Amino acid sequence: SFFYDRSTLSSVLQSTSDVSSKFTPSTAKNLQNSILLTPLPSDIVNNSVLPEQERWISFASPTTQKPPYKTKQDWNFIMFSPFTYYKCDLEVTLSKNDRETISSVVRYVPCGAPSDLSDQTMPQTPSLADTRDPHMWVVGQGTTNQISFVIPYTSPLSVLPSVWFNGFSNFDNSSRFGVAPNADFGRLLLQGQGTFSVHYRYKKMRVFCPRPTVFIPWP
Amino acid sequence: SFFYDRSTLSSVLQSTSDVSSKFTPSTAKNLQNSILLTPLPSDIVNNSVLPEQERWISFASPTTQKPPYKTKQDWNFIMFSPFTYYKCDLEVTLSKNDRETISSVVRYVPCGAPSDLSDQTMPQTPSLADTRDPHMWVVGQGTTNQISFVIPYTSPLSVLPSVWFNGFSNFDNSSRFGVAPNADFGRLLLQGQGTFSVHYRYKKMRVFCPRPTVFIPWP
Amino acid sequence: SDRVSSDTAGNTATNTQSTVGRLFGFGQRHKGKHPASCADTATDKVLAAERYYTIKLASWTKTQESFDHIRVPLPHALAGENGGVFSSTLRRHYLCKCGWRIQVQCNASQFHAGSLLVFMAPEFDTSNHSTEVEPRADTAFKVDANWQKHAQILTGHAYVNTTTKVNVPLALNHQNFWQWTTYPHQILNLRTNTTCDLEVPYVNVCPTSSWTQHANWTLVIAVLTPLQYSQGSATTIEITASIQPVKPVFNGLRHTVV
Amino acid sequence: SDRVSSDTAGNTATNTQSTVGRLFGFGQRHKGKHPASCADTATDKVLAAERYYTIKLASWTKTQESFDHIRVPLPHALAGENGGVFSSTLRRHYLCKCGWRIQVQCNASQFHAGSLLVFMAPEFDTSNHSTEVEPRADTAFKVDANWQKHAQILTGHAYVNTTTKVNVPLALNHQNFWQWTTYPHQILNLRTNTTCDLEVPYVNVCPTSSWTQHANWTLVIAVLTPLQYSQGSATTIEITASIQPVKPVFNGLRHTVV
Amino acid sequence: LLSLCKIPTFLGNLDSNKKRIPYFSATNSTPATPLVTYQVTLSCSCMANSMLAAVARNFNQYRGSLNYLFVFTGSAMTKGKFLISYTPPGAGEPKTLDQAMQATYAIWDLGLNSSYNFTVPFISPTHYRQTSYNTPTITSVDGWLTVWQLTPLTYPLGVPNDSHILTLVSGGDDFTLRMPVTFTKYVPQ
């Protein structure tokens, strides 16, 4: 509980559209304007509309053979998760990467709930705020360019698989073997100008079934 | 305790890289973008990656024979430390030298802990914040361009040498004679635009073994 | 001596004369309680299903190296015809919840050397790794026919072609075998014992399992120390296992799966 | 079973799995009392000196006959550099009083045959017998480098030339080995044990010893039954020993001896 | 997490072809040098992939006993004795059996029981010791554990000359770690 109860960089978000506009899923140099809340690798998978949980990590550059990776994850969690399942609440922190006054709207969607990527129902309003889903709105020179909040565990699963899920998620076993169904804490959609880094803090963290850590090259 | 329980200028820091970038050790006219937390003289020693504790003070200018010095230290502590060892907590204050709105991230690394001067794991995020180490993030027109906090004594030594350490720090006695191993309160790495002055305040200060003060020229 | 142990289960009974005791994973046993996620009263206490099912697993030769292993997906390893009434009942139920009581057997002699690690692991990848093809219903839950090498799993195995593999440093099906000993286990040291006895309770992401889509438990036999012996000593060294589903409870009766 | 024994002494510890117990010579132990013949308060309870000093002694071959032996003069066998702090302290003291706790080691196999007699003897001649030369300080108290034959000691060994030897029927350094079993001992029978454990108190002509002139105790390993084994069995059979000075007390501190 | 540290896990010994194996060899002879030498540091490349080291890499300091488990895998007909020694630092690595047996040691005799559980006592000038280091210091390196052949491995005909001894490590009963940290990152391979 103590070890994991601290914020670690786990994702990055980017938006080029203003607050008062219709949110539209976009990608730019491996950065989407929405996030899948999970410490495990996530990214657009096979042209999915929104980021899904990945089964492996890839370099962003096709040449370098060096990081950054194109996939989003809590490196500290992936590199050190000596357990098979875990349970916890998630404290999320979202920070603007530069000092320009913030003006953003973020929508939190519970695990597996409808994304609702609909049009604005009223002119010049942030479509992400057009919901009863928990959403945050920060703007002005009185603000400090960041947002933080804590969400409860919302997955329909009792505990989440920390590394691998030896199975399929659908009845015709056609899904991507290795990924559990609804194994996340929901998603974060963002609109407004800027690039934002994301941190995860695992509250009341509980782990089950000890298992191997990621292998490290021999010195 | 009362005498030393007050903030005194003890260091200066400078950075030319933005918040959302990879931190890289740099020097510019004797100012690094990281600091070694110790009242004693510290500076880049023999091309060390980061500042190390010095054994002597040098003028910044090769000509003038007048201060500023190129080494960082709490002048008030050096000029008046009538004791051989000391114990205390450290209250650090970091202030931006001009009124331009601040936008900075600072990482505190406990005494002797890994500096972790790694790459960003996610695009457009401050690499210094990509840690569980205590770090501070201040930005916006609502802020007052400064940061202050207190850290506990973290050295593996029971008490710190206030002036000299009559010995070596390694088993092959190859280190710089006079400098004790891990005799500091950790380090401060900073990213974001600006020059920042640093103050130290010695909390619950305790001193041991009376010894001579720095000599003063005869009037 | 105190190493002679007999264990009865239905119309079956295992016997060993070199036991080192039975290890209970998580110090827990499946008590056979009905899943609170099902309204229909479960089918349970089926004596014909609460027994030991014995099967041959593999041949151990001098060519196997440390960490080469054999995997036994559960309950799937027994979902076939040889699963008796446990199988025929399982195939006709949507959900199944149970623990496992297992004994793996392997004898050699006072002149042979080598050791195996026998362990049970939840959510242990049982998919085929000798291909870049997506695992399917009929290839994901099969008992290994050949010893699995160890190198290709330390950082996982992505189901992507060899050239992409270069930009994929880690897969969630990774298994740092250097720590496989953190899983409930026992060691089969040829000089000490010819059997290992384990038992694990029911664990899963939910109250009961839709087994057709998930093999939550995996029995794994990995060599720790390579097999050695001199000219003249018996060369055929085989590994076997007696697997017993502990107090299985079934819910959602329906027509059989094919 | 009850033959597994561990013995701690300072930062050292001996371990055996075939012990037949520890034999206490004269049923006594050195209690570490200061000698009443010295006014200066003795230096004692030096933990760095109250430990086991292990050394290789000899190689046992088929050529050794009954009663061929190896001698270990005490405290001299440990007065060298390898005597650690016991040695460095001993060399700087005029007098020393102590007992001995010893374990000699020697393993073979169920297919080897032969036995050794391990015993401690006070005032047991340790002088060189392969010469008619008078024993000297540097030749009288040395650990045997080669097995000693037995015939030349039954009636003793006079330090006189071969022709005079004819008119000298008996020398006071005689050792009727047929009765060596009357000395505190144990037997190392290859079929039974691989270690022998002995302990003797302090005995001497006086309260404490001017060790530089006297080796009051001698550890002796003699073969009782010759070593035998068939073609194919291990041929290298060696003998070792762990020697511990029991509660040594030192008097008369002075500059070191050279 | 300490639970994990106490589970004996495999050490990586070097094969004659510089390959990594979980054991070392012994035969009918008594080398004048140790069969294996492990420097007592949770940083030892030797225990780099043990659960103990894997966990320790995420902590700053340790304290307490270390358990080195040796399992004899030779034939039932093979006998022999080893001298497992733990030499504290200060006078360098032990060069001979005479030096090794002058430090902390236990004699391991083969027989009915297959393994020997050896404990490296926590002997330190400081209450805690570093898990890793840039350069070895008196607070990060604590000596060596060497296993010697006291008596040669002995056996009858029809038995392979080489016996394999499995080697494992883990924290002892009074072993603890503290201060959660992130280890030097690396690229898996």
Numbering used by the authors:
A (entry chain A), B (entry chain A): 34 to 82, 89 to 188, 191 to 260
C (entry chain C), D (entry chain C): 11 to 268
E (entry chain B): 44 to 232
Quote from the publication.
Human Saffold virus 3 (SAFV-3) belongs to the species Theilovirus in the genus Cardiovirus of the family Picornaviridae. SAFVs cause diseases ranging from gastrointestinal disorders to meningitis. Cardioviruses have nonenveloped virions with an external diameter of about 30 nm. The major capsid proteins VP1 to VP3 form the capsid shell with pseudo-T=3 icosahedral symmetry whereas VP4 subunits are attached to the inner surface of the capsid.
Here, we present a 10.6-Å resolution cryo-EM reconstruction of the SAFV-3 A particle and show that it is expanded 4% in diameter compared to the native virion. Capsids of SAFV-3 A particles have pores located approximately in the middle between the 5-fold and 3-fold icosahedral symmetry axes at the interface between two VP1 subunits related by a 5-fold symmetry axis and a VP3 subunit. The pores are circular in shape with a diameter of ∼15 Å. Models of the capsid protein subunits determined in the native SAFV-3 structure were fitted as rigid bodies into the native cryo-EM density map of the A particle. The formation of the pore is caused by shifts of the VP1 subunits toward the icosahedral 5-fold axis and of VP3 toward the icosahedral 3-fold axis relative to their positions in the native virus. A difference map calculated by subtracting the electron density map of the SAFV-3 A particle from that of the native virion indicates that VP4 is missing from the A particle. The RNA does not form any contacts with the capsid of the A particle, unlike in the previously studied A particles of enteroviruses.
